[PDB]
Design a binder for this molecule. Structure first.
Ligand SMILES: Cc1cccc2cccc(N3CCc4c(nc(OC[C@@H]5CCCN5C)nc4N4[C@@H]5CC[C@H]4CNC5)C3)c12
Ligand SMILES: Nc1nc2c(ncn2[C@@H]2O[C@H](COP(=O)(O)OP(=O)(O)O)[C@@H](O)[C@H]2O)c(=O)[nH]1
Ligand SMILES: [Mg+2]
Length: 169
């Protein structure tokens, strides 16, 4: 029938987590989506021939380490770690997010994809090589995306799904 996959999109404010989600769910580019709104969206898609129900959590709110957020977050089976290629700070923050995932899953190997969004922008302060290097040090895939032009968006989420399959073996 279906396989459900619980995905969680994380990373710093403004990198495009909402835009990426809404682009996948609803196929349009949201210009100014309330930065404080956290919610889950569900989507039925076929990926490599398998009909999937993607439960996607788009994180937002205040920074804080509360027990039910911990429990909200550890239901994730796979994590999109998103930075913007024009936001150096958001790239440097990726390690903190991967540490928070590792802690709440209590595991050293959690399915994860590194995503460099806003790749449609000319102002590029994070190189591709810098991000690939980080991705290879985690053993995880890296993809560049643009929620505005939709390039790479579907691939980034399906690639994560694929990482969840391999983890399951
Ligand atoms: C993201 C995440 C993944 C897995 C488990 C988690 C468990 C608890 C909490 C988390 N999350 C909550 C939001 C957040 C978080 N960590 C930051 O780190 C910002 C800077 C970087 C270095 C430390 N810190 C000073 N920021 C968060 N916020 C998001 C993005 C900005 C901020 C406010 N709006 C939404 C942590 C878990
Ligand atoms: N040029 C460009 N702008 C983007 C892209 N993705 C998001 N944005 C814009 O960046 C801002 C923050 O996006 P949002 O999805 O709210 O980021 P979030 O805080 O991670 O949810 C919004 O103004 C978006 O229109 C992109 O791929 N390219
Ligand atoms: Mg948002």
């Amino acid at each position: 029938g279906m396989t459900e996959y619980k995905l969680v999109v994380v990373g710093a404010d403004g990198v495009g987590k909402s835009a990426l989600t809404i682009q996948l769910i609803q196929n349009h580019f949201v210009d100014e989506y309330d930065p404080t709104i956290e919610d889950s969206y569900r989507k039925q898609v076929v990926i490599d021939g398998e009909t999937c129900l993607l439960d996607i959590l788009d994180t937002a709110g205040q920074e804080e380490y509360s027990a039910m957020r911990d429990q909200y977050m550890r239901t994730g089976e796979g994590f999109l770690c998103v930075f913007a290629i024009n936001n150096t700070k958001s790239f440097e923050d990726i390690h903190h997010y991967r540490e928070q995932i590792k802690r709440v899953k209590d595991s050293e190997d959690v399915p994860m994809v590194l995503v460099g969004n806003k790749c449609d922008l000319p102002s590029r302060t994070v190189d591709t090589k810098q991000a690939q290097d980080l991705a290879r040090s985690y053993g995880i895939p890296f993809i560049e995306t643009s929620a505005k032009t939709r390039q790479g968006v579907d691939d980034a989420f399906y690639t994560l799904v694929r990482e969840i399959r391999k983890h399951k073996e």
